[PDB]
RNA sequence: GAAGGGCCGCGAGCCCCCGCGCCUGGAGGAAGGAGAAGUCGUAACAAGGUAUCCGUAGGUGAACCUGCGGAUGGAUCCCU
RNA sequence: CCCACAGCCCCCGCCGCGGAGCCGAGGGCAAGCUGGUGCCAGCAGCCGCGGUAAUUCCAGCUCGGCGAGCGUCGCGCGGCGCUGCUGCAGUUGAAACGCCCGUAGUUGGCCCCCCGCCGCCACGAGGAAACGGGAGCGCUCCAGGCAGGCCCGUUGGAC
RNA sequence: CAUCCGGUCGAUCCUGCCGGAGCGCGACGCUCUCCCCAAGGACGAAGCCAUGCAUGCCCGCUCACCGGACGCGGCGGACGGCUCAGGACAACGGUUGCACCCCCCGCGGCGGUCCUAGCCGGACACCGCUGGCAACCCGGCGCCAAGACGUGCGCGCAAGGGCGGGCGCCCGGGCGAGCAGCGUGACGCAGCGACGGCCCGCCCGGGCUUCCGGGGCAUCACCCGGUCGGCGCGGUCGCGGCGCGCCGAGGGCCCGACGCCUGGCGGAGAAUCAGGGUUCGACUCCGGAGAGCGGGCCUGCGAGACGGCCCGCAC
């Protein structure tokens, strides 16, 4: 039973969809606290280092932060451990590339370019209504921000738009039937789909049931559906617009590319 | 502790139950005289990969036609037999993988397919010769006998350029 | 030293378990503060640091304390005089001792100075007319620091006048 | 039947195997632990001791050895296999024993010998036979 | 008591019968359940013990089926409250009850 | 606000008594096994020379004998 | 060339050591002729050999198995349907209580088409990897690892 | 990747065991040409230890020497590494909950403080002079710094306490759930402030908690007496016989209690191989416990810490 908090991450416990390789070292990056959590982020070294291949050592990745080429919502960053996750904006200025984190259909992390008409704002999901000092009304999101004095129409698992320049809501999508929705976590991760059903549990999790463009139909728990827009995507998505191929499919692929 | 013992490791080969048997010892020594195998551990790695195979073939055999896990692993165990040069290529049923014999395994060595394209005299000439490596696959030279070639690389193997 | 683990006790069929491992801080304890009334001499508090750097304080000495009549909403700050019943043992009310639950004797002073005349529960009259009102903590000593508490009325007034008259 | 076969059945069947597994020979002498106990050996493959006395249907006189284990202090009987091995065997001597082919059971015609001699002095007593190696140290 | 009292069910809600209601104000509850032995493709009947407090408002005697709610630690032993009671007639056999 | 002191709380170490577990000496007594080519007799296998065996009780150098009741695994599948 | 520096691998030149042991030959179990010794010395997991040809001891010749490895000792699985759920036996080989009543326990004929609950089957959500299985890739092959060429599924690391 | 063989007889058929034939883990013996990978004082001594190393960094404070020393201050040292003694309704694995909880860094908000501010006060460290002592250690006098210490300019604000909904049930800040916040009457002046942060939310982590699983012996058959429950207080971050006082008597057991034993850390997993299974699981990942034995404690958000201190015992 340790004396205190954890501050090491073996290279084997990390996160599967990291995709670290099992003999690359003993150890692996371990993030700090931030906005995300650890399970539902990536560290900013493995964009760095391991995917853009702009960095080849920690050293250099050290050396781009302090250096201040990266922005993370118009904030520089200079932590190498910082933690990135859904729905964030990532533009480094001096290539004159900007990208926004999304989900794969696989269930990994990818890189978005987008344009300069939508990099100014970003989706957030708003989880938590509560009363803090003096009775004034609050709201908390997904990424570990808290807004004062929001609107009464605003109610929880809604999606809301903020402009990044100051901070501040301009319009939000209601959580009903008949929205298009991503999947943030699960088995179906990365999947886009619609609003079928909302089956409610008395004293245990709700199910939101949605189709899929195609026609095909899945499940999942509501902690993990995020919506992006009404009908259409307020957002761009990657290029398939989150279908999953089968196994024969995927490999038919494989062959086709090789 | 080290990264070293994160790696995997195995054995490769089956030795008999029974180890005296007359018609055994007969065929083996046969075997070894027309393939010029240098021990009796060959045979026994060939045996492993044909019981490797049987196996998977038996486990599909099993399910029905329209099974999508039956398909998907009847095509990829058919593709890679077809391209290791094991199976005929008209053949496509999974029955036909059942009735394989260790002989199609030893027939697609490096000496065997030296030999039967006329290069080398015998197995033992073509051994030693490898060892010696005088001979080239495609654009590069191998100097392991047991080296298995692919039917596309087939007419491509020839004598290295730099050979004396 | 002191402890609160259940480690040391029986199980529900009366077994005894072994011990696994030694004492840890998080299940310690402390001895009772014992609140002390008044009656170098002042009223004096300590500070206690518990976990997370929060702060603790018991009292071990008071003499003063609010009050509150909640019929008529007369709330002022009152003397306590001294301990006149208690229902876990006759030693804390021989020793005067202030905990949670003590029925208490306050000086009349502060309410008499005013509606001691106005028309309001007779049985609360009668005794502002007196010196002494009896009273009841609702506070915690040894944990706050403070001693408040409120006028007694109602069926709880006659139980504890039935209870300490004979004596 | 003879054997409890209903749907609700497996505690009857567990305790029934458990009570009577102890039966066969050769599971209470592996998991009773009387032999362990009894063993000289303590479970291991072989042991040291010091020699302290050479003595000796088929009509074979064979020649034996007393030993002394050094770890546990008990006297037991070791036989000595080669042929005209005894010489290199001198009293008060430093050997390492080994058991027989079968565990705890008499070999052969031996009367009550179930143990091995073979290293003499820090040195094999098979390759001395063989003159290998030699005993000019001792 | 959970009506009238100063605590919240929150948690699990099971179901049994009366095994003994001689406490000033608690019970102890009976559960059914199988197990299963993959060896021996058979089942056992277990069954376990299990605490409760039992508020004024219902009459419980042995063999009755009650329904228990989870709380706070009440006491070293008790962790649930009854919350519904169902009769059941006296002199009726004992049976097996998986609930 | 130091040294020091009083009462309680956590609690080491030692003394005393009790219990449990494991090894272990002992005059003498008695059991089993192996070894030899010992002495005394022949109890069983044939109706083994008194048919054999079971339970119980008594007796005798030893095997064993006798009484009461039982079985055939007997030496009888067979008689107004 | 690599390396923090040194090795090692690999590549280019000149010169150039080719070395097999451990067990066994009566049976189980594949592999047989001379000389000694004479129930002695010794072999032998088991059966057994040895008291004048010893097919078994000690030696030479020859032969057999595995092979840069072979043999000996102890433990576990298998052999073993000799622990038996699948799947043992109970007249005579070991083994049906002297008989009856009886609680706990186990097991309980047939019948209502559609309701509720329990078991059951199928699917699904949620939840670490590593190991195991498995798609693709010529570390010269292999044990392995997650790579490589170019015009790369957004290359891939699916499940 | 469903195999049998020799041995009771003058001969024959069975039961039944003895032995052989395979794989794996270790030790011993003989022997060994080249390359690649690779374990390595765990096995009833958690027995004892010379010798060297294993935890530092720096923004703040320079009248030191020529700015670098040193020192005060700040963060870290509670992570990592080793081992398996103890412990058998416990640890542990999966599944719940806190409407009984605490939480440093980091991210985002927020920022009203009752009654010399062209900027307050005194000290010590290093250092100079002077000294004790075998060593380890320190003494006395003396001018000086702060993002150190103390006081504190400031638009009322910490903790706790009294009062404020119903008339059979159900049909917003928020819930499955009367939970939060607020108003008002009394107390109390806590924290921040000489280059402004008290406070709130998330996050990781921890504490306890629901359900199921969790070794052997019946030559251990009855066991427990804070043991079971209730009331009140205290203590705790917090619920709770966690502790104390009073009251009543209960709780567990052949669906195996209690007791005893273990050469007992658990799991993910490993060996073996028709199918069903048997044995092991010190060691790579996770969790737990410990630092000679037994106890106690300071600092700190976080330790009952041992490359931190105090005591007894043995060395
Ligand atoms: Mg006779
Ligand atoms: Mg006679
Ligand atoms: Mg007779
Ligand atoms: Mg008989
Ligand atoms: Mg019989
Ligand atoms: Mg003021
Ligand atoms: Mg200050
Ligand atoms: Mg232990
Ligand atoms: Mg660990
Ligand atoms: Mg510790
Ligand atoms: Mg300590
Ligand atoms: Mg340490």
């Avoid at chain 2, 029974?18 to 045979?43: M, N, V």
Wanted: proline letters at 4%; glycine letters at 8%.
């Amino acid at each position: 039973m340790a004396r205190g908090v954890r501050k090491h991450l073996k290279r084997l416990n990390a996160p599967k969809h990291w995709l670290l390789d099992k003999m690359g070292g003993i150890w692996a990056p371990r993030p700090t606290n931030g906005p995300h959590g650890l399970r539902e982020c990536i560290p900013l070294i493995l964009i760095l280092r391991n995917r853009l291949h702009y960095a080849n050592t920690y050293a250099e990745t050290s050396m781009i932060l302090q250096d201040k080429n990266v922005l993370i919502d118009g904030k520089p960053r200079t932590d190498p451990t910082f933690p990135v996750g859904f729905m964030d904006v990532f533009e480094i200025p001096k290539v004159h590339k900007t990208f926004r984190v999304l989900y794969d259909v696989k269930g990994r992390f990818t890189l978005v370019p987008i344009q300069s008409n939508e990099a100014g704002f970003k989706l957030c999901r708003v989880q938590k209504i509560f009363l803090g000092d003096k009775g004034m009304p609050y709201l908390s999101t997904h990424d570990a921000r808290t807004i004062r004095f929001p609107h009464p129409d605003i109610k929880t698992n809604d999606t809301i738009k903020i402009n990044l320049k100051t901070g501040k809501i301009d319009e939000w999508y209601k959580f009903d039937i008949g929205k298009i929705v991503m999947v943030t976590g699960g088995r179906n991760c990365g999947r886009i789909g619609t609003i079928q059903a909302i089956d409610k549990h008395m004293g245990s999790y709700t199910m939101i049931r949605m189709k899929d463009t195609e026609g095909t139909e899945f499940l999942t728990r509501l902690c993990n559906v995020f919506v992006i827009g009404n009908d259409s995507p307020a957002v761009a998505i990657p290029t398939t617009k989150g279908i999953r191929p089968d196994i024969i499919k995927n490999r038919e692929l494989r062959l086709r590319s090789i | 502790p080290r990264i070293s013992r994160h790696r995997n490791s195995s054995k490769t080969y089956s030795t008999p139950k029974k180890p005296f048997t007359k018609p055994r010892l007969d065929a083996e020594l046969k075997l070894c005289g027309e393939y010029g195998l240098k021990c009796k551990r060959e045979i026994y790695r060939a045996r492993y990969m044909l019981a490797k195979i049987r196996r998977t073939a038996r486990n599909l055999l099993t399910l029905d036609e329209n099974d999508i896990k039956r398909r998907f692993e009847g095509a990829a165990l058919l593709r890679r037999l077809h391209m290791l040069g094991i199976l005929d290529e008209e053949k496509d049923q999974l029955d036909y993988v059942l009735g394989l014999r260790i002989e199609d395994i030893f027939k697609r060595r490096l000496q065997s397919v030296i030999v039967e394209s006329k290069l080398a005299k015998s197995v033992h000439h073509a051994r030693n010769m490898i060892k010696a490596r005088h001979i080239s696959v495609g654009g590069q030279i191998v100097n392991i006998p047991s080296y298995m070639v692919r039917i596309s690389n087939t007419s491509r193997v020839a004598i290295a350029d730099t050979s004396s | 030293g002191i402890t609160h683990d259940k480690m040391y006790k029986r199980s529900k069929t009366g077994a005894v378990q072994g011990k696994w491992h030694k004492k840890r801080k998080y299940n310690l304890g402390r001895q009772p503060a014992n609140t002390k009334l008044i009656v170098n001499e002042g009223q004096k508090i300590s500070t206690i640091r518990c976990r997370g750097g929060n702060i603790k304080r018991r009292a071990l000495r008071l003499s003063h304390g609010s009050f509150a009549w909640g019929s008529a909403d007369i709330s002022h700050k009152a003397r306590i005089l001294q301990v006149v019943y208690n229902s876990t043992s006759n030693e804390l009310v021989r020793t005067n001792t202030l905990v949670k639950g003590c029925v208490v004797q306050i000086d009349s002073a502060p309410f008499k100075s005013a509606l001691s005349n106005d028309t309001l529960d007779k049985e609360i009259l009668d005794q502002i007319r007196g010196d002494h009102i009896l009273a009841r903590i609702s506070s915690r000593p040894g944990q706050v620091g403070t001693a408040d508490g409120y006028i007694l009325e109602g069926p709880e007034l006659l139980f504890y006048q039935k209870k300490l008259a004979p004596k | 039947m003879s054997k409890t076969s209903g749907l609700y059945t497996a505690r009857k069947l567990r305790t029934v195997r458990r009570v009577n597994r102890w039966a066969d020979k050769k599971y209470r002498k592996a998991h009773l632990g009387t032999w362990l106990k009894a063993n000289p050996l303590e479970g291991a493959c072989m042991a040291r001791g010091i020699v302290t006395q050479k003595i000796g249907p088929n009509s074979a006189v064979r020649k034996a050895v007393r030993v002394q284990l050094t770890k546990n202090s008990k006297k037991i009987t070791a036989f000595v296999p080669r042929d005209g091995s005894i010489t290199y065997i001198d009293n008060n001597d430093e050997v390492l024993v080994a058991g027989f082919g079968r565990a705890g059971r008499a070999v052969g015609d031996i009367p009550g010998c179930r143990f091995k001699v073979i290293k003499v002095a820090g040195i094999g007593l098979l390759a001395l036979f063989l003159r290998k190696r030699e005993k000019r140290a001792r | 008591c959970p009506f009238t009292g100063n605590v919240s069910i929150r948690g699990r809600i099971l179901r049994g019968v009366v095994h003994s209601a001689k406490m000033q104000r608690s019970i102890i509850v009976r559960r059914d359940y199988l197990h299963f032995v993959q060896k021996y493709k058979r089942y056992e009947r277990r069954h376990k013990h299990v605490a409760a407090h039992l508020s004024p408002c219902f009459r419980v005697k042995e063999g009755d089926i009650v329904t228990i709610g989870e709380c706070r630690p009440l006491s070293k032993t008790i962790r649930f409250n009854v919350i519904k009671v169902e009769p059941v007639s006296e002199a009726a056999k004992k049976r097996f009850s998986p609930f």
